[PDB]
Structures are given as structure tokens and as C-alpha cells.
Amino acid sequence: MFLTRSEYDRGVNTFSPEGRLFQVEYAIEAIKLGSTAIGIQTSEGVCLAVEKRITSPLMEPSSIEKIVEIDAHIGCAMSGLIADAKTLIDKARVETQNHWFTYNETMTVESVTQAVSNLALQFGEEDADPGAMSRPFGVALLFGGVDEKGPQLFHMDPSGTFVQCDARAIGSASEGAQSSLQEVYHKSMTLKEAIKSSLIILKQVMEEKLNATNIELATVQPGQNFHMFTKEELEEVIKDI
Amino acid sequence: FRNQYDNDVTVWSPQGRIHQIEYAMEAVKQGSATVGLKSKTHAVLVALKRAQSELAAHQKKILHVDNHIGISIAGLTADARLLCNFMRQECLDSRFVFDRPLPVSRLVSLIGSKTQIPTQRYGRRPYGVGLLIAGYDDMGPHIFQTCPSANYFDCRAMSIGARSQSARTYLERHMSEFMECNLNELVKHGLRALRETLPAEQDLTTKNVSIGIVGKDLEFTIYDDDDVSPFLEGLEERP
Amino acid sequence: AGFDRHITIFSPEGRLYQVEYAFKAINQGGLTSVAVRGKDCAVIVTQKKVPDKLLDSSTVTHLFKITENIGCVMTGMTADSRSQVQRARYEAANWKYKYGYEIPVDMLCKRIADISQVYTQNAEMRPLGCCMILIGIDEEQGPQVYKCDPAGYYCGFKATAAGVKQTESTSFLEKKVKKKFDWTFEQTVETAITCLSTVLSIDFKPSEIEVGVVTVENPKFRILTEAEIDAHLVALAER
Amino acid sequence: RGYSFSLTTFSPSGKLVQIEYALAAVAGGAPSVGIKAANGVVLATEKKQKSILYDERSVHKVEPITKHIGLVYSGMGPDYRVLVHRARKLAQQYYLVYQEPIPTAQLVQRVASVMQEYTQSGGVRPFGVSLLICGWNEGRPYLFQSDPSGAYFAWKATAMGKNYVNGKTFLEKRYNEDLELEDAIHTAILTLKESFEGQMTEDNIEVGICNEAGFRRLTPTEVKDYLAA
Amino acid sequence: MEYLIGIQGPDYVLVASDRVAASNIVQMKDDHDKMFKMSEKILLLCVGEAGDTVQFAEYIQKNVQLYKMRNGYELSPTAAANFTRRNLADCLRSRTPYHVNLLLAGYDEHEGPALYYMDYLAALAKAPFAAHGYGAFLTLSILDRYYTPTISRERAVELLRKCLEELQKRFILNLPTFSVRIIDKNGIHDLDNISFP
Amino acid sequence: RRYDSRTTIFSPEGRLYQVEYAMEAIGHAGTCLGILANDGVLLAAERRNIHKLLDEVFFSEKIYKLNEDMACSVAGITSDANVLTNELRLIAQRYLLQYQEPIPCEQLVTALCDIKQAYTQFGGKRPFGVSLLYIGWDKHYGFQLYQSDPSGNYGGWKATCIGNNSAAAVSMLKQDYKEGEMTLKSALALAIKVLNKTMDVSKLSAEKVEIATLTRENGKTVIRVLKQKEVEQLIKKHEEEEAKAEREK
Amino acid sequence: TGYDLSASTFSPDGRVFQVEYAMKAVENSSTAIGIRCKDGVVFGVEKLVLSKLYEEGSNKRLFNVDRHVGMAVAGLLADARSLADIAREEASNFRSNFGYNIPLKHLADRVAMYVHAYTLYSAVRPFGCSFMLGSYSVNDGAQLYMIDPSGVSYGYWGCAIGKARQAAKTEIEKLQMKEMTCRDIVKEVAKIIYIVHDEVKDKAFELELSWVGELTNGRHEIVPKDIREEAEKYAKESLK
Amino acid sequence: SYDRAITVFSPDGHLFQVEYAQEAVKKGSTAVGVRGRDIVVLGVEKKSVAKLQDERTVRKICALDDNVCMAFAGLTADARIVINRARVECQSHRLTVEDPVTVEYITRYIASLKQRYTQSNGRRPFGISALIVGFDFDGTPRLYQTDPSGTYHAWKANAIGRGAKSVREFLEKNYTDEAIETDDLTIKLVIKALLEVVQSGGKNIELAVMRRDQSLKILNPEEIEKYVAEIEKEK
């Protein structure tokens, strides 16, 4: 007994029976195609990690940029469509600098996440502007930064909803990686332990054996700014594991 | 079949029903429950928050529009955020222009117009979110609900969201005492009402409850996880 | 097929079936109107049917005054008729403003008809499902009778009918013009009333019909009173 | 299939079939005949009326765009009037710019450009009418046809409407370039006489001529005199 | 206030300009370059109201180089002159007139050397020799005196030196150093700066 | 099922079928031909309209002059052809206004091809169902022949044919055309030969073809249409030569 | 049959079925009636109480579209509130430009044309509301007008809209409103509404009444509660 | 079902029209790029002369500016539009910031344009992928690739178009620091790679080089003949 009519999934701005709005749900399914990314929030800081998924050896590893810097205080890790990710990263950067210009201060991670979320919401097309993509943004972002409230990790999804999360995983193996996060995570863990645990989980989920090339790792601590672990630092930690 | 007449808001059905609007009204049922009730001196909003996972924080279900108005949402958070921005700008405009707090009834009228425009035109979908609006003005405490259909109501009490009929029947049988209640009694009544909606295994906690109070002397304040513990402690247990 | 259901697309025989359906929309009303010209007068008659007693008989009318010296009778959808009447009044006043003299009946008909053409060529809007018949006196040409239809055809006529009994009525009128001797005002009105009454079988009373006239002596369009209509009706029965 | 309904869709085998359907709409229109004589050009068409009640003087199928240009149509009456107004306006714009009467070739180019302008957009339908545009410029006669497609051609003589193929064969049999317009009007009424299915009279036909004087619609008495033969 | 001079010849065009950019009275820059190479064999010299000079020169330069990249061959000097004239003339009616006075010098393989002159009102004129600025009033008579259509390039640099030392003798403003360069079939060639200490 | 509609959907295997369907349309058109020679370049076309009661009032039905220094012949929908030729003339005169030099041939072709590409890409408008040959002389590259298609893609050809029997025309031209050895007379003879081969009519009527030649005389381009007597002489010469070749065997 | 999908379309037999489908919308609504008498116009609405939770004096179906005119609606309440905003805008614009209170016939015509705009175009649906308008002015007199979703407008001596239109219309027909006065007409309106109300299908209703007339000095206003209670008691007594 | 509009996501969140455009790229002629230590070489196959066609009109390799060039595989008209737009952006960037464009800047702009056409329905994606080569201010060689989707990636060496899979497998095998040591070795590597997938060697490859501070040079057919002869002899 199979009923597969759907007939309402096509076209945003259509509420299907039971009012589910399936285009956005399919966009939320889309990030599972992306590489797994992982974030852990700790008192010492917030760390972000992602698997690069290098297709060929000739491709330059540095060019793959799945962790980026919105500003010194906030960094982002993304999984999903690289292009619309670039769009949202641009929105985040310009909004941070606009806040600096207007108020001579640094945005909070929640405010930056809300700023990008407002842009993500515009798929509904309530605004009359032509230059807004009709489709929802097929990307999920992890916003990690140290603010007045300390280390904070925010998750953003294609819907534009956002929440703080002590630890979250996005991408293909988010299911199962989140269970591993739930068992390992305790609020007291230091950033060293968080880095090690996140790399353990990434090693588990990743098809290829983990190496300094195929992962990208970053941390923002209260004293420091956003920092990316270099080849040597990545070598040290992946050796320590 | 009748798969036709369901595609768009602009198509009437052979029995005078716009099915897309009803499908939007189904959206409020999806969200976590919310309850609102008022006394002669106060208006209260209480909510059941949901979390994607244990590690994730609970979502924000109560939002402050102004000192004298605040809302709680059931249905799409996107539409909720958009409508909240519109309401906030309307209240700011009223304060700038007339230097008076906007009447809550007039604000819900504006919400109704803005929400109605999508339903009639091709293009933008109906706002698939249901809001409970609670505020104090010179006339007194007020509670309104707005449907994804632009129709709005004025209520002694109301509950929206999943499994809200249980809260509605509790509220109806206990409604008479609400009017003369203290704010503590009133928030306790609302907490029990939303407790009706919860699964039997689940129980009210500091985490999953948010409370929103406004009154003659009290501006709209959302009492968060730590701050709900004074109000929650009074409640006895599940029946 | 699918060649219907949009006005723009042509049939494989190039017929534009949608406008032809708009022509049927006129007959759906169940009312008939007749217009006949005379040597010194032009008249319009149409059925007046009040479905309910409660309806104010004064308000219901298909005879409208586009300007002081032009009158029309609309047959079809009441709302589309009223809209076209408003557009005609605007066109007449705008003509007077721009060109300094009263619009000719033929030019008014031409303007309304070419508007109907822009309707039948652009996609989104539909042809107005109504038919207009204009009567006025032109100093050069004497009395005039003209008809617009949903297609944009605007031809002038000696006499015409519109509605459900159009074919019967034009068959009747065709015989009468063929035995042409003249038409004075009384004979003009009598011909109109006899045509309508014969084709419908009604054997009218004064309430059931509304008549409007123009005459070279009194150029202004006037809608005759029930007493005048009964005066004409009794004269018909007596002879 | 889908090619049938859309106007901006080339069908397989590369046919814009809605335009062909508009040409079919033209073919259903009443007969019209055009013959270019040496000293003039005659435009003729049947003005057959449904009933005696119709007043022939009210509307004309043959219209002057300018003093020296006039045209006739076969197809949709409303579309004819849209473009006749636009043609008159284009000619007056030419006169404002250049202070010379517009050439017939230029006018047919402009109205054909308009007709092409309509075909491209999906929101609009093509004009379901074709025209025979006749003119006298530079001491020479002209006859042109402009189709719904937005294309135009120059004909010595041609026919549109019902039985246009048979009328064209009758014309090419009867046509001589040396004809004067006095004979050409006779040939034109004969070409229409092929296809009436009725007893033609002064009212049932409308005919006009162009020459060094300019375009004119010869009166019912004139066409009666020519019909008497 | 700024001096431009151009001398056409049989197979060359010589161009020179003062190297001073100035505030009210202070001569902020002693080595300002008023010569912009639109292409390999064409130069644009520009003087006028500040800002407008560099903006217009850069705009025309980038448009000409875009022409080069798109079409694979350089614009003719005459075509570049007509193009910049069109751009200047269109702006004259507009609310943002570029108050600029230009001298365009070029070499075409087919049409040989060319020198073009245009004022802020955007008139265009080909000329054998021309100058812009207040110094032009002093120095044009030198050229009109000693110029020959068959002048050799050594004679041309000598004539230019005479023209400039006249400015040194008589012109009120201080234009101590001038830049010099020649266009020929080979292309733009820098020459030693004519510097009067 | 159907990935051939709206001209904006890449079908699986990544093909735009609307433009291909438009390219199908030009094949129905009357054959047009262009040959490049050392001294000149010519355009020859078959006047597909051979109705008895048609007047040759115009300069040419197929051949259009776009500028002093170039011309074009068109195969495809006549209305889109008229639009494209008007746009071409405006583009050329805009370049002349801006730079005060004649438009380069390749630049004009490239501009119109950009228009034609644009109509493909955006949703509402159909692709131009036209293919047209350009002939011109420019100072940079001398005499040039260019072809364009509905896709907006152009190329430079020594000789080419568009329209009905274009494959047969190209096959005949491949063997016959002598690179670097043609003169305008020989190219005219070749044009008559390939037209006679392609055109279904046994005898080229000399009212069923229109030939135009572009040559530089006295430093100024001249675009001339060979008159009926000239093309009559050409077909007579070709018939005589072909019969003599027949007579020998 | 794809003819009924859009309002731009016509049926092959000359019927625009979307408009009729919208006319079926109002029949879902609870009844509302308006009666015109010599002194003025009285309006009444049967406002069903869906829940005890809902406040009284909420979900008002009687609106004041200007000081001298009132509006009673049946059909979609959202569309009705929007139409009321449109009518208020039209009345305000009329006052601003022409300097006096809008005539009711003209106001009905303008809002009717605004409604009729929507039946034509494909992008936008017909309104789902049918509403009555009523005013009293010493010059014009008592006037009652009803506008359907189509944009048809007419003047009614008595009118009914909604679910129980036909029964309400016969009850109104046996009334002789022309001679009567408003303070009796309120009682008879209450009687008719109580009659047509179906106790089995509809659990309960709160009678919502308004009038305009000379007794108000030509201002539409909600009934004083004493008069409401008197009329309701009379209606319950007559019901038996 | 879900393949008719660019905007609509599929179940499992696949946008399929952009995939179809990426497939359209595969139809096109091959192109190859390799980064030498001091050279960047860009090689493109030539379909056929046809014997009545002028080769100059058809050129896959093009110079956006003095320091940047691209080659494309995909729809030729779309490539022409994108090339012109990138050229005007190059000159506009020089106008705005008084500095020459960086290779990553121009590939970002081209990618943003392609992305802009993907996001909105009523516009089709540019059916091209490009190989952009240039030397930055530091003088490091840069090679980037773009696709209809709008993602861009640096590559040490890459190919696009038909036979890209085969030639890139060959290049993954062959490429090393040793091969990049010599400019002639870089040119020979790309020539051998194109020889891996092409009907004939000299006739059907059009190749170009950019040096550290020199303009683009399209190698003469005689030079390409000499290089293939050297490659052929060594075997």
C-alpha cells in the first residue's frame, strides 16, 4: 500500500495538506548532501571542524573553504551549497562591518545569526525586490564566536531558524554524529578535549582515513581571535589522537 | 478527486472554501502549544518550548513587540519573525508620531490587513503562523489570537498549537476564577493548562516553560528558564 | 482541446472561442433589450424583472445616462454593465474636456469597443460579459443607434435587439423596416414595445418594462415614467 | 501538443503554429481583392450584412490612413481598427518629423513592425487580421499585403479571405499590367463575383481606388454604375 | 595654469607637459605625470579642474583598453579622439561637466602621426602643433615662428626647449621641469625631462 | 518527458531544444549563398517567392545593406529578419557616431549575435528563428564573409550556404572552391552552378535569384545588385559551358 | 473541466463559475438581516458563539464605515474587514474632495466597482464577502444597499444575507416595514433572527444589532443594551 | 517532476537543472590547464577546420586583461558573453582601485555572475565551465576553474569538457614537480595530455602560454608542430 501522489511538494508558497511546506523541508534535506561539519561550545572557547571531501589530488586543498571568518570575534562553518553559503557569508560580513560603522562595537553571535537568518527568510518573497532567490538557501551554517556572554555556538538552517547549541553537527552524518556528540559532551570539557572528541567523531563518520589535508579546523577563544589550525598544528593533534 | 481547487489561494472551491488558507491554518497545529489568559489587572502568555536535541537550546516562543504588547507564536518561525518586525515598526511609528502606546486592538487590525493581502492575491503564501497577542492599554488587559487566516478574535483566554484543545477545556472550566486572580494564581492556572497539552510522560520544567506577563504597572517581560522557577514551584503534580 | 480557456490563444480554425462564450454570457441573464430608430426619435426598451418584492424597484435599472444627450441600455452581467457605463461616462466627459464639444454617439461606441478589444487581446483580464446599445441625436446625422459587443464590433443600426430573444426580435424588426413607411415617435415606441411583447409573449404591464427615449425636439435622454409607459401600452391594446 | 498553445514556442520542425492559426483566422475573413493598375490601384471587399437593420454608413471596411494611402482587410474587425488607428498615428508622426507624406512602403514597414511587436510577447495574441495597403507615391502605384506574422509582400494583384486561392487564380488569368483602373475595378468586382454566394449590390460591397488625386471610397451610386455592367 | 604642448612631424608627434600639481600657492607635487597612455601608440594629455582630469583620463584609458581586449586591435588615434570628444560633449550638457582641456597624440600605421586638440566645451580639431594653458599664449608664437611641416625630431626637441625656456623667462607661474616623450611607429618613447634648474 | 519548452531549461544531456527547433526553421528557408574572392565578395540567394503576381519594388527581398561597407542576406522568419536588420543598422550607425569610423564587420556580427544569445537565455521571448550571412570589407581584415545562427554563434567562412539544400551547396562548394584563386567572375559562375544544383527548378529563371556583389573601387566600397540582364548572361554562359562539357563526352 | 479554475475564464455556456463559488461562501456564514423603515435602517446579525473563551463584543460583523453609514457583513471576515477599510477610505476621500458626507448610493457603487475589479483578473480571486450598507440622511432618506461578491449593487427595503437568507426573506416579507418605526423594527429583527436560528446545528448565538436614523441624528450606532435586552426578551417570548 | 525549474529543490535536495548545465559542459571541446613554476599553460582542442572556414574567428582561449586569460568548454555564445562581462569588470576594477585584477578576484566575479543566473527562474545557467589563468602581484602562478553552478576552486592542473575524466586521470598520473621544472616540459605535458584525447596532434590543438610578466602568446602552429615532434620522438 503506497500513496506517492505528493503533488504539493513542487513550488514554494504552497501549503500542502497538514500545512507542511515541503520545499523548505527538502532544502533541509539538502544539507545532508554536504560534508559533515561539527561544532562544540566550551567555556575556554568554541571549536569548528569539517571534512573537506577533496575530489582529486590536483585540486588545491586551500581553495576549499568550509570554515571562514565573518570577523575576528565570529567565525562560521558551513555545509551545503557552497555558492549560497558564499552569499550568506557576504551578508554576515557586511552586517558586522555596518554594526561597527554605526555603533562602534562588535556584534553578538546571536545578532549576526539573526542578520543572516533574515536574508534566508526572504525566499518567501514577501518583499517586492527582484534580487532575492526564490528557492530557500540550501545551506546550514554554524556560527561560533566569543561575545559579551562568552563562547557561543549558533546553528542556522535553510528555514532561517536559529538556536544556540552546546554542540551540533551538520551535514551527511549529522545523524549519528549527534548521538556521539550527546554521549561525549559535558559542559566542563576544555577546548583541547572538545577538539579531540570532534576529530574522533569526524574520523568515525568520514569515509577516507583522516589526514591533515582532508579536514579543516578552527577555534575562537576569548583572548584570541578566530584562528585556523595550520598544517603543522593539525598534524600535531591528528597525531595525538 | 478534487486535487484541483487546492493548488493556489486564488481558486475558490465549488462549496465556497479556499483550501490553501485551511491548509495554512493546519500549520499552527504543528507547533508547540501556547496558552494565554488574563485577569482584571494583568495579561499572561505561557508557552511550551521544543528543542531539536538535548544539546540544543529551546526555541524562543514568546517575543516582545513593545513595553505594552508582546506576542507568542505557534506555527512558522519565519512568518512569526516577519510579522513581529512589522508590529514592532508599527508600534515605533505610533510612539514617534503620536507619543502614545499603540492600542492593541488597532495593532491586531493592522496585522489582519497585512495577513489578508496574501490570501486574496496570487503569489505570496498565507502567513502560516498563529499568534497570541497580549498587552495592557488604557482600556485594560487584552488577549487576541490571529489565525493564518487574517481573522482575529478577542479572548478571555486562548490556547494555540498542538494538543491545545485540552488546555482550552481546562481554561473554560476554570475561567470564572481567572478574572479576580492574582498574577501568581493566573500564571499557575495557565501553566496547568499547558501541562494538559504535554504528553503524560513529559512534565513542566524550568527549561521548556516561558512566561510572559504585562500589566498596568508591569511592562511586557518574558520570564526565562531560571525566572520561571518561582511560578512553577507552586504547581503540585500531574492528575 | 485547451484552445478555449484562454482568450489569447487561437483555435486551429482561428476563432477565439472565449469571446464567443462571453456572447453567451449575455443570454444567460434571461433579459432582452430592443432599440429602434425613427425619423425624429430613438428609443430603447428592455425587460425589468424584480426577483424579490423587497428589492427597491427604483434602484434596479439597465438604462443609464452616459451624458445629458446620450443614453444606453446594458444587457449581460450587471456588474460588468455598471463598469462599462462608468467607463463610458468618463470617456464622454474627457472628450468634452479635451475637444470642447459633446462626444458623438459613434465615437463613444468606438472608444468603448476598442477598449473591449484591448480586453480581448491581453491575457489576464476577461472580456466584459455585457452588451451596450447607445442612443443619441447628432445634429448632422439625426438620430443614431449603435451597439458595442464583447468582441469590439461597434456597428450602427436602424434597429436592434440584444439578449435571449435577439434572433426572434431582429426577425420581427426586419419585417417592419422592410414594410417601411416611416416612424414617428409614437409609432417608434409602439414598434419597440410590440417587438418585445411579441417575442417574449409577455403582454406587458407598465412595471415590467422600462423605456428611454431621445427626440430631436428634446435631445436629452429621458426615462419615461410608469404613467407614460402605461399610456403607450393602453394605446397598443386599444388598436 | 504544447507547441499549439504557446506563442513563444517553436514547434518541432520549427513552426510558430499560433501564427499559422492566426492566418487561418484571416482566411475565414470576408473576401478582399486588390489590383494594381498602371494609373491606379483598386481595393475591394464584400461588406455583406447580416440584416437590413444594419446601417451601412456607420462603419467602413476600407479606411484612409492618409490622403494618398488607404487599406482594406480580411480577418478580425477589432484588430483592423486597432492597427488602422496606429497606422494613422504613424503617418502623422512621419509628417511631423519630415514634413512630407509618408511613403506607402515605409508605412507598411512600420505597421508590420507593430504586428511583429505583438507576436513576441506571450501575454498578447497576434492580430487576427491581414491588410491590403495601397498607395500612390512618386507618380507610381503601390499595393502591399501585411500578414499577422509581421511580414509584408508587394503584389501586383492579390486576394485575401474566403476562396483567396481561387480568386488569385482568377486574377492571374485576368491580370494584365497594361490595365487602366477603369478596367481594373471591373476585374476586381469580377474576382469578388466568383466568391459571394449571393447577389451583389451596391451595399453588399465596398470598394476604393487610389490615383494621382489620392485615395477615395467611391460612393454607392458610383459602385452601382460600375455594377450595372 | 598647467602647460601642454604638442608638435606633429613627418613620422612622429612630440608631446610635453609641466610636472607641477599645486594647491593654492604651495606646489604640492614636483613630479606629477599628466600623460596617460590609452594604448601602445596613443597618449592623452589632460589639464583642467582637479579631479575631473584624472577621472576622465582614467575612464577613457580603460574604455580604450577594453576595446583592445575585446577586438584584438588598437583603436585609431582619430577614433579615440572622436570617442573621448563624444564622452566630454555628452557630459557638458549634464550636471557633471568635466572641466578638462586635452591634447591627444597618436601614430597610425595607415594614417601616420596625428595630434588632436579639444577644449572643455568638447570641440575637436586636428592640428600640426597645439598647446593648452596660459603658457600656450606665450609659446604658440614660437611654434608658429620656427615650425616647418618637415621638421626633424632633433629640431623638434630643440624647438620645444625654446618654447619652454620662454615660459621660464616670462610666465608668472613656476614650471621648473617638463616631461617629454615621442610617439612613432615603434611606439611611445620616453625622452629625458627638459629641466630648467 | 518534455524538456523542449520555454527555451530556458537544459534538457538531460544538456541541450537547449528550442534553439535547435529554431535552427530547424532556417532549413525550410530559401537558399542563400555567399562566396569570398580575392577582389570581392558576393551574396546570391534564391527568391523563394515565385508567385506570378508579385512586384520587385524593393532593392532586394533577401539582400539588405547594413552600412556603406557591408551587407547581409537573411534566411528564416521574415519578421525577425526585419527586426534584426533594423537593429544591425542602428548598431552600425551608433558606432559611427561614437568613433567616427565605419563599424568593423566582426564587431557588428558579434553585437547582433549577442542580442540573439540574449533572446535564448531569458525566459519570455523566443529565440530569433533567423540565420543570415554578412559580407563586408574592413580595413583591418579586408573582405570578410560571416554566418550566424539562431544560437547566437557565428563563424567566418570563405564560402557557405544557408537554407534549403545547404548541405548539397556546401558539398559542391568544397570541391569547386579554389582557395586563393577565386575572382568575382569565377565566384559568380560557381554561385550559378551551386544554385542550379540546389534549386529544384531545372533552369534558373533569372527572376528566381538575386545576386549582389561587394567590391572596393576608388577607395570606397560599392554594393551592387546584378541586374536581370547580367544574371541572364551569367546563366546563359553557365548553360553553354555545362553543355560543352556535356558535348565532349 | 478547467473552466471553473479561474475567474478570467468563461464557461462554454457563458458562466463565470468562480464568482458563483464565491457566492456560495457567504451561505456558510451565519445569517444577517437589515430592514429599512420610515425613520431609518436597522441592522441585525446572528453572531454564533463558537466558544465560551471568546470575549463578548468580539468578532463584530457590524462595522461603522463612516459616521452616517454602517456596514453588516456575511462571508469571509478577513475579506469583509478589508472591504470595510476600502469603504472607509472611499468615504474619507469623498469628504476630503467633495466636502460632504458620501451618498450611500455612490458609496455602494464605488465599493461595488472595487469588488467587480477582482472578478475580471486572473491573478486575484473574487471577494468572499457579501455585505449590506445602510444610512439615513435628512436629504436622501433611509437607504439600504447590499453588495454581492460579484459587484452587483441594489437597494432593498429589506434584505438578508448568509445561511438562512430565504427563510429570513419570507419572514421579512410579511412585515410592512415602510409604515413602521425603528424602535419596533429592532424587536421584529430580533424575532426574525431568533426564528431563523437553528438550535440543533448552531449551539448558541448572541444577537448583535445596530441602526441608523433620525433617532440617532443620522449616526450609525450600536443599540443601547436596555433596548437590546427588551428586543431579545420579546423575541424569546414570541418564539414559544 | 523536479527537473523542470531551477528554483525547485528535489526530494533529497538536488537542484537538477544546474546538473544538466554541468552535463552540457561535458559536450564541449576539451581544455586543459597546468601550473608551471614560472608558466601557466592553457591548451584547448580544435574541433575541425571544415576547409571553408576561417580559423581566426573561432578562438577558445581569450585574454580578459594583460595578466589574466581564460579558456572555456561549453556553450560558445554564453562563453562570449561571460568573457566580455569579465573584461569590462577587469577594466572597471582597475578604474575603481587603481590596481590590476587578481585571478581569484576575476574568477570570483565570473562565478558570482553564473550564480546570479542560477538562483532565479526565468534565466538559464551559463552552460560553460572555464579555466582562468594568471599571475598575481607576488608572481605566483594561479589556476582556477568555474562551473555553471557557481563554485570556483583552485587547481594545480585540471581539464574541462569532453574527455576531461580520462585526461585528468592521465594528468594525475603524469603531473609532478619534475614536469613543472621546465617551461617546455609544461607545454609538452599539456600537449601529451590533449594528445591522450584528440583525433590528431598538431592540427587539432590550440595552445597558449602566459609568462611571468608578458602578455598571452598563442603558440604558432609551427611551434606546436615542433613540440609534438619532440614529444613523438621521445616515445
Author numbering:
A (entry chain R): 1 to 241
B (entry chain S): 2 to 240
C (entry chain U): 7 to 245
D (entry chain O): 3 to 231
E (entry chain X): 1 to 197
F (entry chain P): 3 to 251
G (entry chain T): 5 to 244
H (entry chain Q): 2 to 236
Excerpt from the paper describing this PDB structure:
Endogenous PA28 subunits are known to form two different heptameric complexes: a heteroheptamer composed of PA28α and PA28β subunits and a homoheptamer composed of PA28γ subunits. One-step affinity purification using an NbALFA nanobody resin yielded proteasome assemblies capped with PA28, including double-capped proteasomes. Cryo-EM analysis of this sample allowed us to determine structures of single-capped PA28–20S and double-capped PA28–20S–PA28 to ∼2.8 and ∼3.3 Å resolution, respectively. Additionally, the tagging of PA28α with sfCherry2-ALFA tag was performed in the cell line that already contained mNG2-StrepII–tagged 20S β4, demonstrating the ability to multiplex orthogonal tags onto different subunits of a larger protein assembly to increase target specificity. The high-quality density map of the PA28αβ–20S complex reported here revealed a composition of three α and four β subunits, different from the 4α/3β assembly observed previously. On the other hand, the PA28 4α/3β assembly derived from heterologous coexpression showed only partial association with native 20S when assembled in vitro. These results suggest that PA28 in a 3α/4β arrangement may have increased binding affinity to 20S compared to a 4α/3β configuration.
The proteasome plays an essential role in protein degradation and is critical to maintaining cellular protein homeostasis. The mammalian proteasome core particle, 20S, is a large, barrel-shaped protein complex composed of four stacked heptameric rings, including two inner β-rings flanked by two outer α-rings that are each formed by seven different α or β subunits. In each α-ring, the N termini of the α subunits form a gate preventing unregulated protein entry and degradation. There are three types of known endogenous proteasomal activators that bind the 20S to open the α-ring gates.
